[PDB]
Design a protein around this ligand. Structure first.
Ligand SMILES: Cc1cccc2c(=O)[nH]c3c(c12)CO[C@@H](C(C)C)C3
Ligand SMILES: [Zn+2]
Lengths: 46, 161
């Protein structure tokens, strides 16, 4: 795909969940650089 | 030409990345279906990704976008989860890492919520979960996320429900 004309990306913002944060979309791989690699486990709630 | 450098848990940089991770966990509307049920992570390791070629590739595109957006790159740090993480850190992001059926268009997606990106570590919808247990909520197997520098430039605002 291509971004909207004259735009370099898309900001998707949830309108129903005020606690959900934004998501973003770029259409050129060169606009992102994988700065940190994080290794983790999810933790079971107590 | 990619090198991974371990950050120390006693390093401010490690701690800053861990806090972004932990502080952006939220609940999801699928009740944990895709990414599992959790309120926090156990961080095992944080490595800095160094590749001179991929960096200049990024800073060259950043300059173009910046000048197109009147000297404003609009650069952020954002999370990305993917089955393709090991290819990404060595070869960089490209069309193969895009989401054809994303609800904001067929591009490469990033999240402010770490738990949102966690939903994609084992694939769209969580795939079939971890390889070993086939458990999307596995508390045993190790997962990896990327925390990325992203150039947004002039970004189109789309509201979604
Ligand atoms: C859609 C979305 C929203 C927020 C974060 C993310 C994220 O962090 N990763 C991915 C997606 C995503 C969707 O595309 C997948 C690829 C493997 C197809 C990876
Ligand atoms: Zn497992």
């Amino acid at each position: 795909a291509h971004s909207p004309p004259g735009h370099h990306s898309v900001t998707g913002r949830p309108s129903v969940n005020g606690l959900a944060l934004a998501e973003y979309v770029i259409y050129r791989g060169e606009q992102a650089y994988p700065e940190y690699l994080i290794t983790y486990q999810i933790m079971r709630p107590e | 030409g990619t090198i991974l450098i371990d950050l120390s848990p006693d390093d401010k940089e490690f701690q800053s990345v861990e806090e972004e991770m932990q502080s952006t966990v939220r609940e999801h509307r699928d009740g944990g279906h895709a990414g599992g049920i959790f309120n926090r992570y156990n961080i095992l390791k944080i490595q800095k990704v160094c590749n001179k070629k991929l960096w200049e590739r990024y800073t060259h595109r950043r300059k173009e976008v910046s000048e197109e957006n009147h000297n404003h790159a609009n650069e952020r740090m954002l999370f990305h989860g993917s089955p393709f993480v090991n290819a990404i850190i060595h070869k960089g992001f490209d069309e193969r890492h895009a989401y054809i059926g994303g609800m904001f268009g067929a591009g490469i997606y990033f999240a402010e919520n770490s738990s949102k990106s966690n939903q994609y570590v084992y694939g769209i919808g969580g795939g079939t979960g971890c390889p070993v247990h086939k458990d999307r909520s596995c508390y045993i197997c190790h997962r990896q996320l990327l925390f990325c520098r992203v150039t947004l430039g002039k970004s189109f605002l789309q509201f979604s429900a």
